[PDB]
Write an enzyme that holds these catalytic residues in place. Structure first.
Site, mmCIF file in Angstrom:
data_model
loop_
_atom_site.group_PDB
_atom_site.id
_atom_site.type_symbol
_atom_site.label_atom_id
_atom_site.label_comp_id
_atom_site.label_asym_id
_atom_site.label_seq_id
_atom_site.Cartn_x
_atom_site.Cartn_y
_atom_site.Cartn_z
ATOM 1 N N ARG A 1 81.067 4.717 49.834
ATOM 2 C CA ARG A 1 79.795 4.054 50.064
ATOM 3 C C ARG A 1 80.053 2.549 49.938
ATOM 4 O O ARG A 1 80.696 2.097 48.986
ATOM 5 C CB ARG A 1 78.775 4.581 49.035
ATOM 6 C CG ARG A 1 77.526 3.742 48.778
ATOM 7 C CD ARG A 1 76.490 3.881 49.867
ATOM 8 N NE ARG A 1 75.983 5.237 50.016
ATOM 9 C CZ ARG A 1 75.156 5.595 50.989
ATOM 10 N NH1 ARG A 1 74.749 4.688 51.872
ATOM 11 N NH2 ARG A 1 74.721 6.846 51.083
ATOM 12 N N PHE B 1 69.345 3.447 43.417
ATOM 13 C CA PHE B 1 68.935 4.700 42.777
ATOM 14 C C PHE B 1 69.110 5.845 43.776
ATOM 15 O O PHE B 1 69.760 6.851 43.479
ATOM 16 C CB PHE B 1 67.481 4.556 42.279
ATOM 17 C CG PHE B 1 66.765 5.865 42.060
ATOM 18 C CD1 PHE B 1 67.179 6.746 41.075
ATOM 19 C CD2 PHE B 1 65.679 6.208 42.834
ATOM 20 C CE1 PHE B 1 66.515 7.952 40.879
ATOM 21 C CE2 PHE B 1 65.009 7.407 42.644
ATOM 22 C CZ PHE B 1 65.429 8.279 41.662
ATOM 23 N N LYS C 1 61.460 9.877 54.359
ATOM 24 C CA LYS C 1 62.702 9.594 53.630
ATOM 25 C C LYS C 1 63.190 8.176 53.834
ATOM 26 O O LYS C 1 63.939 7.636 53.014
ATOM 27 C CB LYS C 1 63.808 10.620 53.942
ATOM 28 C CG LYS C 1 64.640 10.351 55.188
ATOM 29 C CD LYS C 1 66.002 11.027 55.091
ATOM 30 C CE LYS C 1 66.823 10.853 56.379
ATOM 31 N NZ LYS C 1 68.248 11.315 56.205
ATOM 32 N N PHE D 1 65.347 2.852 62.796
ATOM 33 C CA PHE D 1 66.440 2.507 61.911
ATOM 34 C C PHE D 1 67.189 3.761 61.465
ATOM 35 O O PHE D 1 68.420 3.741 61.338
ATOM 36 C CB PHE D 1 65.929 1.741 60.694
ATOM 37 C CG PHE D 1 67.017 1.293 59.753
ATOM 38 C CD1 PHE D 1 67.794 0.182 60.047
ATOM 39 C CD2 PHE D 1 67.258 1.981 58.571
ATOM 40 C CE1 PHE D 1 68.799 -0.247 59.179
ATOM 41 C CE2 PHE D 1 68.262 1.561 57.692
ATOM 42 C CZ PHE D 1 69.033 0.446 57.998
ATOM 43 N N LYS E 1 74.282 -4.992 52.346
ATOM 44 C CA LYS E 1 73.803 -6.113 53.142
ATOM 45 C C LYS E 1 72.623 -6.848 52.506
ATOM 46 O O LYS E 1 72.364 -8.018 52.809
ATOM 47 C CB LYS E 1 73.434 -5.622 54.544
ATOM 48 C CG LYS E 1 74.630 -5.545 55.495
ATOM 49 C CD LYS E 1 75.442 -4.270 55.304
ATOM 50 C CE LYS E 1 76.587 -4.181 56.309
ATOM 51 N NZ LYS E 1 76.744 -2.805 56.887
ATOM 52 N N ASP F 1 71.941 10.536 46.118
ATOM 53 C CA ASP F 1 72.122 11.180 47.408
ATOM 54 C C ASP F 1 73.610 11.394 47.719
ATOM 55 O O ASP F 1 73.963 12.376 48.378
ATOM 56 C CB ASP F 1 71.463 10.372 48.529
ATOM 57 C CG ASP F 1 69.943 10.393 48.464
ATOM 58 O OD1 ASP F 1 69.366 11.059 47.574
ATOM 59 O OD2 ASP F 1 69.315 9.735 49.317
ATOM 60 N N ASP G 1 75.043 14.951 48.635
ATOM 61 C CA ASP G 1 75.564 15.058 49.998
ATOM 62 C C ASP G 1 77.077 15.300 49.953
ATOM 63 O O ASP G 1 77.719 15.406 50.995
ATOM 64 C CB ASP G 1 75.279 13.776 50.797
ATOM 65 C CG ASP G 1 73.811 13.638 51.227
ATOM 66 O OD1 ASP G 1 73.054 14.637 51.182
ATOM 67 O OD2 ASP G 1 73.409 12.514 51.617
ATOM 68 N N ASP H 1 64.347 16.977 54.341
ATOM 69 C CA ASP H 1 65.707 16.894 54.869
ATOM 70 C C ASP H 1 66.564 18.059 54.341
ATOM 71 O O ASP H 1 67.202 18.768 55.116
ATOM 72 C CB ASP H 1 66.313 15.547 54.470
ATOM 73 C CG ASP H 1 67.298 14.995 55.499
ATOM 74 O OD1 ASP H 1 67.364 15.466 56.663
ATOM 75 O OD2 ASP H 1 68.024 14.064 55.116
ATOM 76 N N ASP I 1 70.981 4.896 62.135
ATOM 77 C CA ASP I 1 71.838 5.292 61.024
ATOM 78 C C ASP I 1 72.496 6.657 61.303
ATOM 79 O O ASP I 1 73.676 6.862 61.013
ATOM 80 C CB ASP I 1 71.038 5.297 59.711
ATOM 81 C CG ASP I 1 71.836 5.848 58.542
ATOM 82 O OD1 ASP I 1 72.447 5.051 57.798
ATOM 83 O OD2 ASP I 1 71.853 7.081 58.367
ATOM 84 N N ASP I 2 71.742 7.579 61.889
ATOM 85 C CA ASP I 2 72.288 8.862 62.330
ATOM 86 C C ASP I 2 73.395 8.688 63.381
ATOM 87 O O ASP I 2 74.499 9.220 63.246
ATOM 88 C CB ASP I 2 71.173 9.731 62.925
ATOM 89 C CG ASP I 2 70.201 10.270 61.875
ATOM 90 O OD1 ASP I 2 70.380 10.035 60.661
ATOM 91 O OD2 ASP I 2 69.238 10.949 62.284
HETATM 92 O O1 LIG Z 1 73.527 8.007 53.244
HETATM 93 P P1 LIG Z 1 72.921 7.058 54.267
HETATM 94 O O2 LIG Z 1 73.354 7.383 55.677
HETATM 95 O O3 LIG Z 1 73.148 5.627 53.833
HETATM 96 C C1 LIG Z 1 71.125 7.358 54.281
HETATM 97 O O4 LIG Z 1 70.603 6.707 55.313
HETATM 98 C C2 LIG Z 1 70.440 6.721 53.060
HETATM 99 C C3 LIG Z 1 71.078 7.022 51.696
HETATM 100 C C4 LIG Z 1 69.955 6.964 50.664
HETATM 101 C C5 LIG Z 1 68.723 7.181 51.514
HETATM 102 C C6 LIG Z 1 67.439 7.493 51.081
HETATM 103 C C7 LIG Z 1 66.461 7.649 52.063
HETATM 104 N N1 LIG Z 1 66.751 7.510 53.372
HETATM 105 C C8 LIG Z 1 67.991 7.212 53.799
HETATM 106 C C9 LIG Z 1 69.002 7.046 52.853
HETATM 107 P P2 LIG Z 1 70.921 9.128 54.630
HETATM 108 O O5 LIG Z 1 71.486 9.264 56.026
HETATM 109 O O6 LIG Z 1 71.767 9.829 53.580
HETATM 110 O O7 LIG Z 1 69.477 9.588 54.646
HETATM 111 MG MG LIG Z 2 72.955 8.568 57.281
#
Ligand SMILES: O=P(O)(O)C(O)([C@@H]1CCc2ccncc21)P(=O)(O)O
Ligand SMILES: [Mg+2]
Ligand SMILES: O=P(O)(O)C(O)([C@@H]1CCc2ccncc21)P(=O)(O)O
Ligand SMILES: [Mg+2]
Lengths: 340, 340
Positions: free
Chosen positions: B103, B89, B191, B230, B48, B94, B98, B165, B234-235
């Site tokens: 993505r 990056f 994070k 935010f 976005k 990640d 993960d 995390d 996202d969660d």
């Molecule tokens: O992977 P996303 O959900 O996009 C995430 O929000 C992103 C991915 C990279 C990053 C770095 C720091 N904080 C959130 C994210 P996450 O849930 O992994 O924490």
């Molecule tokens: Mg997430």
């Protein structure tokens, strides 16, 4: 041995590096700060410390002895430890990428049960610590920005060289046609020579107020040739070195690497020999690796390297004659003793 | 929609970012520079662009319109793209850590045949590009060092949060006892909140000559609360969002993450419900994941989140009243519209 004599003070400074990087007490991040402690203690300790010591040695030789106060020495030791944190960052991540087993006489950090690919983040944390230390110790110094930029540019250069290394060694694929001398020299220049040799000396230079672009250029001209030899020797020792000394098991052959050895083999091999290499290189199987090594000895590459070392030594010495001045030749000769 | 109106100019600036990061012609590194091109083009394009656009939007609102020349605008777009390179990056690395699949509506870079763990280096290269761009465009500006340090500190903060995390979600292990509200809030602050919200605004601030520590403190007070919401959203969307919109498949449950949802579940669950969660959380099996989601809906967590969003919106608005000044409230309200 100017190294052996700076060493013990340098090494004992580590407890201080750690202490100050843990004095970020925000009790909320305590657990993460404990993990960083573990990561530092497993990953920046257990090597020779030659890169960091080089900063401390060169600093002693470049700075007016009267200007070598306790504080400006503390900064030299810190900047030394910054170079070692850079190496720890690269090692941790490269061992993952290379599927390595051991490093510095223990199992690789990422192979530790409970770690695995989390080591990617641990490695980034180690890189981050460089810049926290430069800020903590050096922010008020004239050469602050010089150092930040040097470390960042060194990293970029190193990552660009690793890119070339990985592109030249595509996994699961035959290709000896990639393994040229021109390619080899570019790889090692970027992946090794800049950060292992230019970086620590330049750092000391900047710290001593030597920032002239001609002086750095001349220093680079010697240090980059040293770096190339160093990577060549690291390649040779990947296969023919003793793991009690190297502290790790070599994977270059099964990793399909453009190693100095494979480049020399290709220069010397007959069409038959070429085919043995083709069938056996870049593969996981111990008998296949054994065949390549047998071919290398078949071609007396250990003796070729011994002669290359002598030729290289003589050439580096010529370069020091040509390019050392205005700086103390001892700066480069200490390094040369260390590596040859 | 100040975003929609800065967007197309921002996005079309990417060809320029790429061009200038490829004008490092040293023909020896050509192949590596071609790989960086590929990496940029797969990994910083397709999202976005809200973080980078925020730099450009805030810059327009913070800088004297007369001082908004073509050059200082070029720098704003570059610094925007720096924030997006930081996100690229983190995402690339990640997704590896993960074990993610997709993505931004394509397969993850590292899942691409031929890539794999080499993506660790590609991700470091993207981070390196930030600092090459700051040098190329901003080195002669008064706020140069301000920006370098902001980006480096943001990264450190982000890596420290990711550490928390990962430590809170040890793989293959049961432990809901780790999943507390206090822990959750610390995680997301480090994070997510610093780099996603503080960083882009602060960047614009520094660029407009607003460097006062009180002004940054007040900005932070709003932006860090926005960041927390935010990450919460996202969660929620990791499980209950539509992958056509999110562009990725959620793994929080099988990754054993300390997600907002699991924290709320634990606050609300009966001992029986607790046991279902215990048996089923943090495991790869689709029926196990399905059971947790069923428990979450069982507890009407979608409705809880809807009420939290409204409460959060109102609270952020109060904070903007309290803390926005001396800066244009529009700076924060544009952001709030974007996220709520
Ligand atoms: O992977 P996303 O959900 O996009 C995430 O929000 C992103 C991915 C990279 C990053 C770095 C720091 N904080 C959130 C994210 P996450 O849930 O992994 O924490
Ligand atoms: Mg997430
Ligand atoms: O792994 P090592 O042999 O120590 C190596 O020399 C080191 C490891 C990290 C790193 C980074 C740049 N250049 C060399 C190395 P490599 O042979 O992998 O290139
Ligand atoms: Mg090696």
């Amino acid at each position: 041995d100017v190294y052996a004599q700076e060493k013990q003070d340098f090494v004992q400074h580590f407890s201080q590096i750690v202490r100050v990087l843990t004095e970020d007490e925000h009790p909320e991040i305590g657990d993460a700060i404990a993990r960083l402690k573990e990561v530092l203690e497993y990953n920046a300790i257990g090597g020779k410390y030659n890169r960091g010591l080089t900063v401390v040695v060169a600093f002693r030789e470049l700075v007016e002895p009267r200007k070598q106060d306790a504080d400006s020495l503390q900064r030299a030791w810190t900047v030394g430890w910054c170079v070692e944190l850079l190496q720890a960052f690269f090692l941790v991540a490269d061992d993952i990428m290379d599927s390595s087993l051991t490093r510095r006489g223990q199992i690789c950090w990422y192979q530790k049960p409970g770690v695995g690919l989390d080591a990617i983040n641990d490695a980034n944390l180690l890189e981050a610590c460089i810049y926290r230390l430069l800020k903590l110790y050096c922010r008020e110094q004239p050469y602050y920005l010089n150092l930040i930029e040097l470390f960042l540019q060194s990293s970029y250069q190193t990552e660009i060289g690793q890119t070339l290394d990985l592109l030249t060694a595509p996994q699961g694929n035959v290709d000896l046609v990639r393994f040229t001398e021109k390619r080899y020299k570019s790889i090692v220049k970027y992946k090794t020579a800049f950060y292992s040799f230019y970086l620590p000396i330049a750092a000391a230079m900047y710290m001593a107020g030597i920032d002239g672009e001609k002086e750095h250029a001349n220093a680079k001209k010697i240090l980059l040739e040293m770096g190339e030899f160093f990577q060549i020797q690291d390649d040779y020792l990947d296969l023919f070195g003793d793991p009690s000394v190297t502290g790790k098991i070599g994977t270059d052959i099964q990793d399909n690497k453009c190693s100095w050895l494979v480049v020399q083999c290709l220069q010397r091999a007959t069409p038959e020999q070429y085919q043995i290499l083709k069938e056996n290189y870049g593969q996981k199987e111990a008998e296949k690796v054994a065949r390549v090594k047998a071919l290398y000895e078949e071609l007396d590459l250990p003796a070729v390297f011994l002669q290359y070392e002598e030729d290289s030594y003589s050439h580096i010495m010529a370069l020091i004659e040509q390019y050392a001045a205005p700086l103390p030749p001892a700066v480069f000769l200490g390094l040369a003793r260390k590596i040859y």
